[PDB]
Amino acid sequence: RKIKRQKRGKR
Amino acid sequence: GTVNWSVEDIVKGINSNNLESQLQATQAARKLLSREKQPPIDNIIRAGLIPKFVSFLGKTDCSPIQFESAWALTNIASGTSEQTKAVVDGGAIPAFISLLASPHAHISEQAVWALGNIAGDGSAFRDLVIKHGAIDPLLALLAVPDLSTLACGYLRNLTWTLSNLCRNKNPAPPLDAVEQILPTLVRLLHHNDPEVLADSCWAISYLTDGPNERIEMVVKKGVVPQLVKLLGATELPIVTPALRAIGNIVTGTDEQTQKVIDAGALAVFPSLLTNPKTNIQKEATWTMSNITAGRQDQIQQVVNHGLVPFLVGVLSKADFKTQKEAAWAITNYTSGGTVEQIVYLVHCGIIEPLMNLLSAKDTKIIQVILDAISNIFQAAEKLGETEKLSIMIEECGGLDKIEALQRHENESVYKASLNLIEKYFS
Question: Of B198, B186, B253, whose CA–CA distance to B225 is shortest?
Fold first, then answer.
């Protein structure tokens, strides 16, 4: 019944 | 005057035999790559500068060029998967790991940042970073009696990079790596900085998105009460990952779900199920749908916390996707609940919104609603009150909807609808 269903630059 | 250099000038300087000229050119490249207006990453890569930057990462007695090259490479690795790949292909992973032990805090932090971008590209680079031995020095940076003695930004970058090491599936992170990271992750999950808390919750939500064995690895560390506390937080960036993690956890066994219930999570759901952020409402209703798929005592705890009226409300008015999650929650409730619980559901007014939702174009929600109605009719049969339920359904206009569904494109839909009409509306 139960249903199971990044980068950052600097400056 | 390292501003607005040309790539040709940067190349001329980096190809000089002069460490200071190379430093000037590397800083100029860093400044080019750190502008928000279309940083010329591909031009820098085509110029062949990545291997030079990587070699600069190893110049111990020129810490400025270490820092400038680390920053330039971090910004390159922050781009597309091909640009990150160009960084990895230049040999950057072991150089950055060696920098993690630098006596200069800004250089170690920059290495942490770069490794975070690389690992965050995907499962393969995540596991490659792990194979090069990043976890030990990363965790060594956090082995302090009190995390509050570290610089805020440094700690935030460490937390974000660890979270990326917990991120992504197919495959999930190595089990030994997760076991090695989890104690520090719990410690961070008790830290007081909002961004550290948000990224720790994201990490936990990643680690709980998988088989029940992973959920168990996490839940065994006793983080569920802290997750419920953070579920009560005022900062949306904290509540979102906390709720995602709690939902993941309640997709597991009934014992893990019970750990969520015992920690007091249901008391937060009156607000979550009315939260003005659509995504919060949808995620909370999905969590409720997996709680109603559990044992009858757990359904009873849902009842005791007064959440059935909130499910009726969401079914009556919400974003359509949230309404689908609510319909699924009702179907699970009716499939697993006692006759008394189903009767209570009806007394709360589920029938009218449930019937209103039978006019949606979505076929799956119609199937779900028809199954729920069949379960409710079975409960009524067990009480011999089928005629009352039929009258109720007819008064709100549901009989018309089901009769129209009798002639519907999908197969299961019209079969279930015809069965209902024949069995209870004769």
Answer: B186
